[PDB]
Paper text:
[name]-1 and other retroviruses integrate a DNA copy of their viral RNA genome into the genome of the host cell, a process that is mediated by the virally encoded enzyme integrase (IN). Each step of DNA integration, up to formation of the integration intermediate, occurs within a series of stable nucleoprotein complexes (intasomes), involving a multimer of IN and a pair of viral DNA ends. Because integration is an essential step in viral replication, intasomes are targeted by an important class of antiretroviral drugs, the IN strand transfer inhibitors (INSTIs). INSTIs work by chelating the two Mg2+ ions, blocking the active site and inhibiting the strand transfer activity of IN.
We determined high-resolution structures of the [name]-1 intasome constructed from all the possible combinations of single and double mutants that underlie E138K/G140A/Q148K, and the triple mutant, with DTG bound. These structures were compared to the structure of the WT [name]-1 intasome with DTG bound. We began by measuring the median effective concentration (EC50) values against the single mutants in a single-round infection assays, which include E138K, G140A, G140S, Q148H, Q148K, and Q148R. Both DTG and 4d potently inhibited WT [name]-1 with EC50 values of 2.6 ± 0.3 nM and 1.5 ± 0.3 nM, respectively. All INSTIs potently inhibit the WT virus.
Author numbering:
A (entry chain C), G (entry chain I): 212 to 277
B (entry chain D), F (entry chain J): 222 to 268
C (entry chain A), E (entry chain G): 1 to 228, 236 to 268
D (entry chain B), H (entry chain H): 2 to 44, 57 to 139, 149 to 228, 235 to 270
The structure:
DNA sequence: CGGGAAAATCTCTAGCA
DNA sequence: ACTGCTAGAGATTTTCCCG
DNA sequence: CGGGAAAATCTCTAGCA
DNA sequence: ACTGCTAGAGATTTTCCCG
């Protein structure tokens, strides 16, 4: 039930930036999504990113590929 | 309190000092002689 | 330094020497020279060396009017994906800007439009068109195209493609639609190797899917967490760390000194 | 890897599709595709429909995505081939249009529309369009008084139809449906691309005869030999291109 | 890929898809798609992302004419040091450019002048003034102020200082000379914490001193070196490495496999 | 041999291909239809 | 005689750039000067730099200071 | 460090200056300065001279660096205070001009020239100028036919005088001499700055009485106590500011 | 050896027609 | 065959100074 | 584990009134 | 209370592939 839903929410890749770095940070793992913030995991680090600085996709291309 | 000197709009002459009302990431809101203006942080210095 | 400072202001009132020159010529600590410069109004002539970061939420679009061969091209872009819409219009008028905006809002979920302060966008006719479709208008700091970095960058890619295909069309509107097609579906790269069309499809489908999934997750997973405080609402748990939202403030706490109920 | 046999069994029992096996058991999509393709007992998103309605003395030119009911329409000055080809080039730039169905009317069989379809890569072929024309006309009649010109009313009707009216099995609107269907086609195309990439590779494992390649994992290599899926360690198999 | 390549060129002739889009849509190796793009004339629309480096020898000066309050200001700069000279002149004319250049060459060792291709610098009257003082003229690639990065950057600092002191002078020529003074002697920093005046003094004195010292060193230290070749002329030795100049080609060799005679 | 496409002088339209005669650090010398030109390396691509 | 001259030529600081780095490299030690090239020592490394990319000074301030 | 005693001896023998001790024995300049300042038996570059010559009906206004013979001249339209003050502001912007000697002529005692000197920081005081005027006139007479106007000829003469005519003890031209003299003044000013910086510090070593500070090295601290220079390890002395 | 403060370095920007 | 740079503002790392 | 080649990342630029 | 970016070209580091 719930665990399938959580492992599905963690299948989406998140591209984000920090408040003073102009370069986009590579695909993290989406843990939780909200109206104003998303919670991600990037290299065994848990960051909270505003919604306006994050791009969340699935990569229908790496899915279909393992 | 903070003094803010700025470059408002298509004008090369820097103006100031103005009261800092709000500092966001990238832009600031100031008050310069009962006139509220929004200046990007590329065009303003805050002291 | 009382004699060294009084002579330094007397020299700054004339030459406006920077903090270093006054530190060398009057034997001052760097802080004192920097202070003397910082108190001079005529020396505050330079901003700080950074750039902001535009909004890249899934519902934000940047619009702008660019010009080519005497004609007006109204261009829009989906900021999260790079998907562009464009159209040659006879005039920069709020009427046709509103027509363009209504067409756009009818084809895609447009939550917010970001534009500069051109008269066609600040028109009372676009305000009515954005109110009807439930769109939010964000205008930028006047005379700052950097606040429209995305659409202004798209004004260059679009014009660049048009010159590549201009000789396959008699009229400029055909070349504009060809360029829209080519950009959206024949140029791949970016954050997923996608084209702009694939990327907008992914962005929008992912938004819907994640909203539904997290709605289910919150409907089922209902816990309260005490840490170090009040019953913060649980958001996520695992890997020896817990994420919670205490009074609309999301913070990350380790699994230690935190109990889930 | 370890669930390939379970997926084979679940297909031989329930005749499921590869999406479910790949989601339920955690298999690369190519392996589940081969599982569903090994049983002979177990054997649209780019098609739009075009037509022209007449209303208040002007010509509305409507386009429907058949799979989703999504509608693209606009008022044109003249029912001609120039404006039809322009509408079609626009649509093809907005959505991946692979085929368009029309009613052999004069504006649709023109050389300009044919040339536009050739450039965009659209295949021209000569009752959903009628029902959606009826629904669009009903919505237009509803919302007509909120605008002065007809083209504005048509765009408000298109907005209402695509995003405000919901229905079907899950209660989704035409916009969400078209987005989901296009995402599904993107997945299908990516899978076909990967299958086509790997199909020109042969694997020699343990040496045994050549085998078809399915997946080149980080700790294993999946192969299909004599209509049977087997797993071999990477160091125990050599992949060559043919 | 013969069927995949023939279809890709047919698609590129229409849409001009970049190498990635044609690698994804036609199953091509990146090299083949990049080749198909590289052979299209209509796609070669972007230069390489670098910048050059101007000459900063001790004898190079960059000159330029800038405008302020309807008046013409002829500005020069010593590239190695940042020392500027300036003058308000009534007209951008080779006559007064030549007067300025002769004054400059009389006050400092001017070996070479770098300028853009304005008519006053490309004048036959400056060619005579530069020939008489033994100056070498380097003109830049036309319509490339980056080739004058130093003097163009100095057109901004000079104008910036003038506005700081403009209200201490009735005329603009006085403010220009005030700004020259302030820049050259009241602004410190750079490669030695110097001002422009101190730095030009150091550069020139160091040039003279090092030329004299190395003349003596070569007059005394006279050796030939064989390495791995011919009798290369010795330049320096120490710290387990030898520097020599074999047929006008300076290269560094270690102390091993090298004998000094 | 090398093809060089370039952007000569105050003109947005890229030209080429031209023969590469000399590659310096920052600028190149090319030959385009019996016309020798000096183009900076910001304004030229060499293939 | 000669050794004083060499240790004097090595008292001058050299600021230089490489052919693709826009930033100026800190003060090296001048070993040999020529018409077209200077030979320097930067962090126990011997580099040959063209004359047009090098600024050679003494730093009258660090001399007068040890 | 180790040569301080040798330098003291060489001064008590030959009465040398601190530049030589600092160059010969390898001492920080402040230590050699104190060595030369401890003996009471052992006890210009910013001064220019201005004047006006008349030639061919025009007024040439010449400036000489007394220490080097370097010359700055130019033809002015009128022997007035505006042009004199402009010439002086120009010169002060080019070279570090600390003092200017003039001949109390009307143009030199004007309020504009006085205000220019005040702004630039020049001290006004009211036979080298005459000899250099003669030499400049001789050169001008030589080179006059190579130009049409007189101002151009004056600048060619200034170029010749400053860089083409060489003489003196070492055979250097006026340009090299002025550059060397200004470099020497830069060294002198930097040394005075460092001495002034360190003179407000007192050192307590081994605790003994306070001592004047001279140098704060990387492996030692040099101090002067009771007119005697001693070396102490950094860990053996504490420096305070007073 | 350990923090804190001050100094040095690094990064990045507008303006220069 | 020729060529972006300069100075200032804020951030971040190094060095030094007393324990 | 060791080179080589190919792929991924990094760095940096013009143009967008 | 708001905000530079995008895509391409060359350089450099990572990954992979067979020994
Ligand atoms: C008639 C002469 C001859 C032919 O060309 C024109 C036009 N021009 C244009 C600029 C200018 O665009 N400065 C802005 C800028 C841009 C980029 C950069 F790196 C440096 C910069 F200063 C000049 O400064 C300048 O002197 C001239 C000029 O002199 N001429
Ligand atoms: C009359 C409206 C309202 C008020 O202001 C004007 C003037 N303007 C100027 C540019 C422009 O300067 N683009 C160059 C650029 C410079 C920097 C950057 F980051 C991005 C850039 F695109 C525009 O694009 C633009 O749309 C306008 C415009 O619309 N208006
Ligand atoms: Mg605009
Ligand atoms: Mg714009
Ligand atoms: Mg110019
Ligand atoms: Mg210029
Ligand atoms: Zn000031
Ligand atoms: Zn092409």
């Amino acid at each position: 039930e719930l665990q399938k839903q959580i492992t599905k929410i963690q299948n989406f890749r998140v591209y984000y930036r920090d408040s003073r770095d102009p370069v986009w940070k590579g695909p993290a793992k989406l843990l939780w999504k909200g109206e104003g913030a998303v919670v991600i995991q990037d290299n065994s680090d848990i960051k909270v990113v505003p919604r306006r600085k994050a791009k969340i996709i699935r990569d229908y291309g790496k899915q279909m590929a393992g | 309190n903070f003094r803010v000197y700025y470059r408002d709009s298509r004008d090369p002459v820097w103006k100031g000092p103005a009261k800092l009302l709000w500092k966001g990431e990238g832009a600031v809101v100031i008050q310069d002689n009962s006139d509220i203006k929004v200046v990007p942080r590329r065009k303003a210095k805050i002291i | 330094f009382l004699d060294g400072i009084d002579k330094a202001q007397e020299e700054h009132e004339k030459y406006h020497s920077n903090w270093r020159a006054m530190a060398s010529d009057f034997n001052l600590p760097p802080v004192v020279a920097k202070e003397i410069v910082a108190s001079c109004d005529k020396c505050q002539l330079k901003g700080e060396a950074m750039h902001g970061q535009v909004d890249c939420s899934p519902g934000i679009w940047q619009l702008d009017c660019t010009h080519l061969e005497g004609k007006v091209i109204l261009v829009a872009v989906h900021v999260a994906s790079g998907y562009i819409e464009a159209e040659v219009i006879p005039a920069e008028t709020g009427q046709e800007t509103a027509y363009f905006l209504l067409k756009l809002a009818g084809r895609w979920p447009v939550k917010t439009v970001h534009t500069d302060n051109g008269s066609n966008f600040t028109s009372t006719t676009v305000k009515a068109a954005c109110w009807w479709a439930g769109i939010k208008q964000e205008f930028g700091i006047p005379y700052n195209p950097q606040s429209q970095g995305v659409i202004e960058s798209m004004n260059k890619e679009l014009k660049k493609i048009i010159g590549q295909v201009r000789d396959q069309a008699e009229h400029l509107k055909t070349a504009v639609q060809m360029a829209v097609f080519i950009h959206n579906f024949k140029r791949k790269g970016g954050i997923g190797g996608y084209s702009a069309g694939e990327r907008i499809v992914d962005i929008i489908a992912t938004d819907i899917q994640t909203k539904e999934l997290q709605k289910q997750i919150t409907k089922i997973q209902n816990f309260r967490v005490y840490y170090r405080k009040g019953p913060a609402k649980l958001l996520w748990k695992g890997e020896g760390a817990v994420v919670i939202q205490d009074n609309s403030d999301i913070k990350v706490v380790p699994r230690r000194k935190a109990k889930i109920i």
